[PDB]
Design a protein around this ligand. Sequence first.
Ligand SMILES: *C(=O)[C@]1([C@@H](O)[C@@H]2C=CCCC2)NC(=O)[C@H](CCF)[C@]1(C)O
Ligand SMILES: *C(=O)[C@]1([C@@H](O)[C@@H]2C=CCCC2)NC(=O)[C@H](CCF)[C@]1(C)O
Lengths: 233, 244, 244, 222, 250, 243, 196, 204
Amino acid sequence: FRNNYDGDTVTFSPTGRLFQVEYALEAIKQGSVTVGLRSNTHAVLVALKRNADELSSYQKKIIKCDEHMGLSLAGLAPDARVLSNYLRQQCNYSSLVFNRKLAVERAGHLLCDKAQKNTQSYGGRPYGVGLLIIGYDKSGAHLLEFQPSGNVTELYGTAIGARSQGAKTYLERTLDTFIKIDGNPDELIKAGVEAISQSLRDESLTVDNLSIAIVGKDTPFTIYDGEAVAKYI
Amino acid sequence: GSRRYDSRTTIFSPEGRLYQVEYALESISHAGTAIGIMASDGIVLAAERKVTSTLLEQDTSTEKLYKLNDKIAVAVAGLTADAEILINTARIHAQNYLKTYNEDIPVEILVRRLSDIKQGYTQHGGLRPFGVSFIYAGYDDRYGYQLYTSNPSGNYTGWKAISVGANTSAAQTLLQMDYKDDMKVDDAIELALKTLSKTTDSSALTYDRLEFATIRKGANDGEVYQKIFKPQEIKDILVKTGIT
Amino acid sequence: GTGYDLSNSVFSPDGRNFQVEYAVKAVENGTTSIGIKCNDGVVFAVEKLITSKLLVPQKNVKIQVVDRHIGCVYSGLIPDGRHLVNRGREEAASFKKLYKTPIPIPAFADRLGQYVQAHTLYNSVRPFGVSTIFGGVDKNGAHLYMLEPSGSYWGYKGAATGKGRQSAKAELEKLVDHHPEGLSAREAVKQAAKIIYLAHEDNKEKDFELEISWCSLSETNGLHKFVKGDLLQEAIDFAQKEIN
Amino acid sequence: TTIVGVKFNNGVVIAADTRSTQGPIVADKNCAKLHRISPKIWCAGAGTAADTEAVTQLIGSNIELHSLYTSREPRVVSALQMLKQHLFKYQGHIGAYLIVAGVDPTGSHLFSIHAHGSTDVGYYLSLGSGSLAAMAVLESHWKQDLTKEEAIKLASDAIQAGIWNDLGSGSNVDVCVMEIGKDAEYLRNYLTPNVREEKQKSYKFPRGTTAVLKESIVNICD
Amino acid sequence: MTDRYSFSLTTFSPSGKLGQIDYALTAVKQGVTSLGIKATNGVVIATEKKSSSPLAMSETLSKVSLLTPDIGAVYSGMGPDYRVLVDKSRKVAHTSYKRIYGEYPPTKLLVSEVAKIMQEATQSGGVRPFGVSLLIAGHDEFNGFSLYQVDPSGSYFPWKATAIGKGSVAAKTFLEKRWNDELELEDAIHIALLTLKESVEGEFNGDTIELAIIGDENPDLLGYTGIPTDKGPRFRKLTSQEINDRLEAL
Amino acid sequence: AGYDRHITIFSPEGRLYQVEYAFKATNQTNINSLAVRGKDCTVVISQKKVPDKLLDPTTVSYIFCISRTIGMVVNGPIPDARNAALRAKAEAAEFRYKYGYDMPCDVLAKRMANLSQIYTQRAYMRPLGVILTFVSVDEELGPSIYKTDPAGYYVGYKATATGPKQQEITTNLENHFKKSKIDHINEESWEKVVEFAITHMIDALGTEFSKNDLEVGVATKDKFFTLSAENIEERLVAIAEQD
Amino acid sequence: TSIMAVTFKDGVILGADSRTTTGAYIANRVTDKLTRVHDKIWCCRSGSAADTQAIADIVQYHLELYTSQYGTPSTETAASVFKELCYENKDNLTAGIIVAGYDDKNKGEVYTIPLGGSVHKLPYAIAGSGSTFIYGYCDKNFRENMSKEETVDFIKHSLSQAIKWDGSSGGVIRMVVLTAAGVERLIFYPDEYEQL
Amino acid sequence: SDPSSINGGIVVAMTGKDCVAIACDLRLGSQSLGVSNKFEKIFHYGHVFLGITGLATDVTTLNEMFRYKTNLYKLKEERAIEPETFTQLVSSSLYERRFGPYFVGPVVAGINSKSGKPFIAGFDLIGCIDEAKDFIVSGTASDQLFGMCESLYEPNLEPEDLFETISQALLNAADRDALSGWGAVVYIIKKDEVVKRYLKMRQD
Ligand SMILES: *C(=O)[C@]1([C@@H](O)[C@@H]2C=CCCC2)NC(=O)[C@H](CCF)[C@]1(C)O
Ligand SMILES: *C(=O)[C@]1([C@@H](O)[C@@H]2C=CCCC2)NC(=O)[C@H](CCF)[C@]1(C)O
């Protein structure tokens, strides 16, 4: 079965599946966990940076796309770089040509479309990375979940990566609570770190291991790493 | 995708051999034999016509001996249609050279170029190689009379006498047996006919199954002359040499 | 033999294109969506499965507009759906640019049709994993259409695709017989809200969100618009009421 | 140059003078300005000689191929459409001014094409520097329902008006008659009203008159 | 999209065979018999018009095609492949010869062009060889009359007489018995009819047989008069009636 | 090796299985059609079947108006049929622009047949699973019927039929012509030719037709048009008042 | 050149002189500047004969393909195709074109497309070198919803004046009538219109 | 400025009884500066002769081009090209450069090897063919040549007589042209043989 229909992305299986796409999705699950959630005034990204050795660094998992937008990745880092770069250009184009900040919902549509092309044509491969996009535009705070299949969804919060299901159930529970954390970033972040710790197991989030990013009303997307996240451990 | 149907005509075998070249040579080994013999006063080209009929028009036929230049000719062993493609481009390279330098193209330059074209189909492009082997007979003022050979791989070498096509192993041994450096065109003509006569897979060796050519420097002139024997001319030389 | 279902544009011994058939499977595995043609317009509605409380309500819109008078909804691989609408939009802009008049629905349908049919001609591409219900109002009326992964499409009185297409078609066929005079835009909206609630039984396990849009000569001026607020809730209730 | 076309009751006739000039010099006293596009579609050309000839042969070649492909007789309107679209594309750089005529399954036709690609239709036409002398004759003697013989006369006279009054025209008159149900008849040098009178003297030189420095045989046989 | 088949579809097998060419030849073998005979003052080519249905109008389908006014062709194998080959042959005769020299190509050269086109379908990327064998008969001032055969490989050879397709073996044998270098055109036509009769199962008349010749110039088929050097085409397809007249003297 | 069945290259028997399987696809619609030539018109009859009640019957057709003078009926799946129709229309329009006269029915047929031949020879292109029947009243040839298939083959017909029960329609028509000894329906009005066409459709298939079971296209000097349900009904009534 | 198109009660009429010049020489005195791009959509051509012919031929081609796919085109659509060609190629064209067509729903319509490639829908339009001389006359004598006879008279009188003062205009006056009833060709000779 | 007036030179061809003659001067200058007195403008491919006047670089290029083309022609046709055919080849080769032409004035002369008929033709720089029965002129002194030919010429002259005529036409035309002269060569052509003679003339 499967073996005969998963040699490339241009082949449907007898049940209507696209294995190459599915295998790509598997790269995300293998990726380190990262969480995203928002109130009505801010959006936060909390990501667990994974290290190779104890002599190695903890790979960055958050990229800023513009002053009002940014994302977190889980999976093939290179693909995240390619996709965020594309997002940076799209944000840029909107500003230069229309003097308009790109709508988070529009960015999601663009990413979906860019990924889709890599699932219907011979020779290419699907992107092997998941992305959580947060931003503050003319309609407030926003959080988006991007999957290599090209499916992009807007949520109040979520998580992707290994053991992500932990943080996800927690947020699906804490919903009514954090969604009202307006005017108070520190609280939103703390709630973000509480959702992420729900996916720990191996170790515990340290200083050079935790990565946080926030954006909102009067806060340009900024990234906090190391000492800057100490007050949250 | 398309990859599924790609034969990959340009890859190495685990032994470091090129599949298609090897198979093309196999194809050539079933082609009518062609022989080249170089003498002190000229070169002889003789080939056996593969398959013939009573109704085949031999006077208008030519399937093995082609004029490339007024000083160079080739004997063909393999796919005739493939051969004509190469012969045409070779005829063009010769003229490009002539127009550029105002001198007839040295024999090796032309042979190397044609062999390079062949080598290309061997390393890139994904196309099958040409199922052809050539024996080049020519003359230039740097090396005088020359005899060369090129095959599907794009490799070429020079010879005093050589053969391509069917039964070259046998044909080569016979040539190596009776060839002599001080030979004369007429001696070579005879040696060629005898050799084909012994390797033929057919009953007898008649004129209607042969093509013959000579590149000589007619003493009474001073220039080089190519002679592509006519049916009757072959029939004659065939009786004279004692084959009737 | 076998293997006729591994490459996209291959005819199997019985004349079928298995890859297109497998694409259909992707469609049947998708959410249910429908369309109802009324006396002066068309209504579109679709089921939006609520994977969790985390999905922001009303946000992940599925129905798409092309130009200003066409509505499109589809079942199957969503990204393939967007891809097809992007093409539709270029196709529509190009038509208006040259002819000035916005593109007629029949003309628009063949544009989508030819494009989808094109993805069943080569093995370098994969067929579309969606069935699309679209339509609108033009120079001479309203038109409803449904396009399959094979490129096949026809004009419809009512149409549905996805998980609960059977329930829907059943419900749609009822309306057709009981209303030979034609349903109204206002009525079609409610009727649509119901057909979706009913058809939701084939997926009763997960909660969902209803989405409706319409294009009516009298209700929207022939422009495609989404059903929101009061009018939306009114249809939701009309459905919640008849689901018991 | 003087070229004309004249429709008659059952066909069409075209004529032309035979002078070719390079500036004020007569390069050819008997060139042929009548070209065949297909067996029954002929063309009279004015302007740049290489162009009238080249364009006529190109379209003629393509028309022959089209004929073979459709298993039908070539139509004048096809030669006309192919010629005009080719000439239009080159914005007048191909200096071809033609009068295209012929008979085909749909009847007999007469058209004119200018270098820039515009076409015209009429019962009688003329182009070239001799155009005005010719048209004066045509505007004076043409009438509807002409016989083949009357047409040949009119066309022939129109050309003469040019030979005699236009310095750009001279020598002979060539004609081609295309009749609805017959073969087209090409009449090369239908009129030759400019034969040179016998010279006053013979300039044949006595052998040895010319001084020679060296002499040799040229080898042609390879 | 984009043809991504840039590799050969015909390649050498371990035995040295080029499968696709062999198979193409096999297709030719299943084809209806066609033949050609060279006389001293002409050449004749003929074949059977195997009507695929009595409702079909056999005339609207010529197996014998005029390539130049002095050259014609016939074939055996896949008709569609032949049809496009004829379109290409008629065109190359112009683009590669008439537009350069202002005269039609001599039979051997046009045959050479056709052959090249066929050879290329044996090596170019993403194509299959042509499933046909052609017999081209023509005439040119410096070569006189000639007859050639072009196979799927692109190879071609000159013949005094020959046949291809279904019963070629038998037909060739029958031709070898009746051919001599003194046959007049009418003799060759007669021999052609006799050879073709052995290959035809059903009706054998001017409506089921197609025949053309390359003979004298037909000034009556020219379409115009006035140029001494233009005497008319040498290629002429015989009419159903002309065939029947000769069948009575069978 | 076994791929000589997936793309268009010869099989050891010298066959092209993909072209054969494409012919198989032509009958997928289970529809039959036939065409006949009148004294100065050309008629084409084709079964019409609308199974789904949710369909708009007016949008279900297999006949196309290629140009002002040419009509085309297709036997095969609708998407390949529409692909063929669009190409034919573009070809017809271009021909007029370049050559100055309307593209003849047989020429358009040869052109589409040649395109088909290409899918037969180039691997990256698949054949279209359809059979195309072209009709018109050619200005040079008179009433004309030319049909092309997935093999790139094409020819002219006195009359023809296509579909699952093609053979029965064909023999029926063959018989009628062996009897009449002429190659057309000697009727002055196309209405009677349409009636003849439908009459033999019925006889051959042994079935009765309502006004919504058929589809009709007619070609006359300078115009090809399709009949409406009512035009057809008027046809069905006429034939009824004879049996 | 003098060309005009006039809408009236029953549809629309196109009119034009029949002169083509090359300097002061009359190359053609019986030219037909009224060209058909569709059954009931015609145009009046002015400027370059070669350019307007090429434009028209292309428009006719576009509308023929349009018809084969989407049925009869509106007059507005025809004017859009002319426009596209004239605007996008404005640097290399010299074409003053008036598009006129009859629609059953819209009746008669006139669109004028001058040198730049801009489009203008009007009750009537005049163009060509000869038109300059009849701006005053036409502005004073035009009325909407005139009868066929009245419109034929308006156009005949207008063009006779254009022909009178403009040396680039002359020959016969041609007209084309477009109404639900069909297409009618009219021609008026010098002897008639000169003494108006 | 004018490409056809930089190097100078003339060529003239004539028909006679069963023969043809083609002649040319030998000058090659740089405007007023004489550079070479050995620049022959007549070439031959088999039995076909080609004279070319005009810009020297193009005269050389065209010769090399036609040698190249007639060589391939012979290899495929298996016969030498004829005058009529070559003329068409010259014509289409020139037209191929319609908008960037070779600045030359070609002249073809020869006898058809099969019909024995004498043949001469002239061309303009873009291939237009002039197939005259009597004579053809080309070069910086073409006006002078027309004057010489129109008077001195008469039909069916024997080879020895045509020689005197062609020569006197060439010589006296050249002496009225500042850019022509410095030597001259005449070719007498017959079915079987061809004689080439160099004439004695002023060297100023
Ligand atoms: C006539 O148009 C001219 C002819 O020389 C050429 C020669 C052969 C046939 C095409 C026409 N063309 C000219 O340029 C020349 C002088 C123009 F003023 C000519 C004699 O009128
Ligand atoms: C009118 O515009 C002119 C006509 O010759 C052309 C010919 C046919 C239809 C389009 C119009 N165009 C001109 O250039 C010419 C002279 C202008 F000064 C013309 C007579 O006015």
